[PDB]
Amino acid sequence: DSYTHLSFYEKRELFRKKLREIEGPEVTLVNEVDDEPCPSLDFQFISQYRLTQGVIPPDPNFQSGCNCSSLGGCDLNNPSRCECLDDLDEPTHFAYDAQGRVRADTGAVIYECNSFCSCSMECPNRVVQRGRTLPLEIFKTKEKGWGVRSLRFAPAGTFITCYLGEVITSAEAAKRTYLFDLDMFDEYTVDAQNYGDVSRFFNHSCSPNIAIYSAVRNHGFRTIYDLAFFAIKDIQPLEELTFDYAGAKDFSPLRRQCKCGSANCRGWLF
Ligand SMILES: Nc1ncnc2c1ncn2[C@@H]1O[C@H](CSCC[C@H](N)C(=O)O)[C@@H](O)[C@H]1O
Ligand SMILES: [Zn+2]
Ligand SMILES: [Zn+2]
Numbered sequence: 001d002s003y004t005h006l007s008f009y010e011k012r013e014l015f016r017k018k019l020r021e022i023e024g025p026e027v028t029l030v031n032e033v034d035d036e037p038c039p040s041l042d043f044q045f046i047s048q049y050r051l052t053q054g055v056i057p058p059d060p061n062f063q064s065g066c067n068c069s070s071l072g073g074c075d076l077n078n079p080s081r082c083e084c085l086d087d088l089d090e091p092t093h094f095a096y097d098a099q100g101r102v103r104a105d106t107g108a109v110i111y112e113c114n115s116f117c118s119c120s121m122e123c124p125n126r127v128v129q130r131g132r133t134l135p136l137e138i139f140k141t142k143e144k145g146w147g148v149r150s151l152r153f154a155p156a157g158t159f160i161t162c163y164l165g166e167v168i169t170s171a172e173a174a175k176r177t178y179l180f181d182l183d184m185f186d187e188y189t190v191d192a193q194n195y196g197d198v199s200r201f202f203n204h205s206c207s208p209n210i211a212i213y214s215a216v217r218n219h220g221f222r223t224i225y226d227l228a229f230f231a232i233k234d235i236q237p238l239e240e241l242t243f244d245y246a247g248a249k250d251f252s253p254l255r256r257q258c259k260c261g262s263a264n265c266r267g268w269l270f
């Protein structure tokens, strides 16, 4: 295949070295199950979408901000008047509560503030934007390959990370698993095989503990938005992070049965 000249030790140290180059809280590597040293060594970690030819990026002439200024950004207690929330229904509220966690009544769409807005980067409505906050750990699972788990307790509503990768068209997808359509608002797709984030290793579960929230900050066509993972159950340290691929991430582009321990596992094929 490749990287045959590198020993088990050499491979593991180079991946751990790649992880330390990531910005933000630490990301660690662990394997107590078998002898695979690490995931692919040519994989590249990124912090924002990598666009490809064919992708029409957003037009900044459609961008709108909000007037709030104040002392420390927008005010959770005055959800009205903040223009970023106008798209919401009559009892308008920010997606986030006082603790910084997504609210229980929040829908599938989170409207955040932009660079056009007048609020600072400490605005309460820039949670997804400020990025990951939990230390994560890539580890080898028993029957699912690699997976991710948290080292700190993550109550429900805690932001975890975003799904990143190459943004590509249907055509580019045809020429070429890991495909994650941007189908919330109705042809761009996210391919995380060569470029992506830690979330590239999140495994599937039929009773998951994290879910996807479509975070929108652009006021143009909603062809590109953030795929934000939030906890929907409480997550104890070392608990594997899993979400429901169905409707979101593809199971395939002679299969393999699902191996989640849920008592209601429906039994998908990969
Ligand atoms: N509940 C699950 N049951 C069985 N296989 C799973 C699974 N969740 C993920 N997988 C496997 O991992 C793939 C999703 S991508 C991430 C898988 C893992 N992080 C790795 O790279 O080794 C699937 O195609 C499947 O082969
Ligand atoms: Zn505002
Ligand atoms: Zn705003």
Ligand SMILES: [Zn+2]
Binding pocket: 066, 068, 073, 074, 113, 114, 117, 119, 123, 124, 125
């Ligand atoms: Zn704001």
Ligand SMILES: [Zn+2]
Binding pocket: 205, 206, 258, 259, 260, 262, 265, 266, 267, 268
């Ligand atoms: Zn299952």
